[PDB]
Amino acid sequence: TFRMRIYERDDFRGQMSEITDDCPSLQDRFHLTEVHSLNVLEGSWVLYEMPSYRGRQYLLRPGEYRRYLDWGAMNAKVGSLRRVMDFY
Numbered sequence: 001t002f003r004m005r006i007y008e009r010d011d012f013r014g015q016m017s018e019i020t021d022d023c024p025s026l027q028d029r030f031h032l033t034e035v036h037s038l039n040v041l042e043g044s045w046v047l048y049e050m051p052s053y054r055g056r057q058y059l060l061r062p063g064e065y066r067r068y069l070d071w072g073a074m075n076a077k078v079g080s081l082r083r084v085m086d087f088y
Contacts, residue, residue, distance in 0.1 A: 002043030002083045004060070006035045010067045013037070022082040025051045034076040037066045044084035047071060051079040059084070 001020065008014030017030050026032050035047070040062045049055030058071045068076040 002045065003041045004038055004043075004045055004081075005041065006030075006032070006038045008032075008036060010036045012039065012064075012066065019081070024053065024080050024082075026078055026080060027051070033079070035078045036068065036076045038071075039064050044086070045081055046084060047073075047078050048080045048082075049073075049077055053080050053082060055079065 003018065003020050005016050005018050007016050014036070017032070023029055026035070038060070040060050042062065044062070045060045046053075047058045047060060049057070056073075058073055060071055065071050068074075
């Protein structure tokens, strides 16, 4: 299963949305343009700066990410995300 929770504000504050499937446009599905903290519960995921898996990407392994600095980004702008298919 793949599962992650995204929050509106840093440090797991604000409204939380749970995702278990690929998301080519976070704006369309969640009316969201930024993610300020997230918890990856199962599976690995890639965050992308832009819709449809374009722009800079950030790899996320299971764990807790309280600020956007934690996944190495410069800002909290996210346009899409998807599941990592690497087995190893």
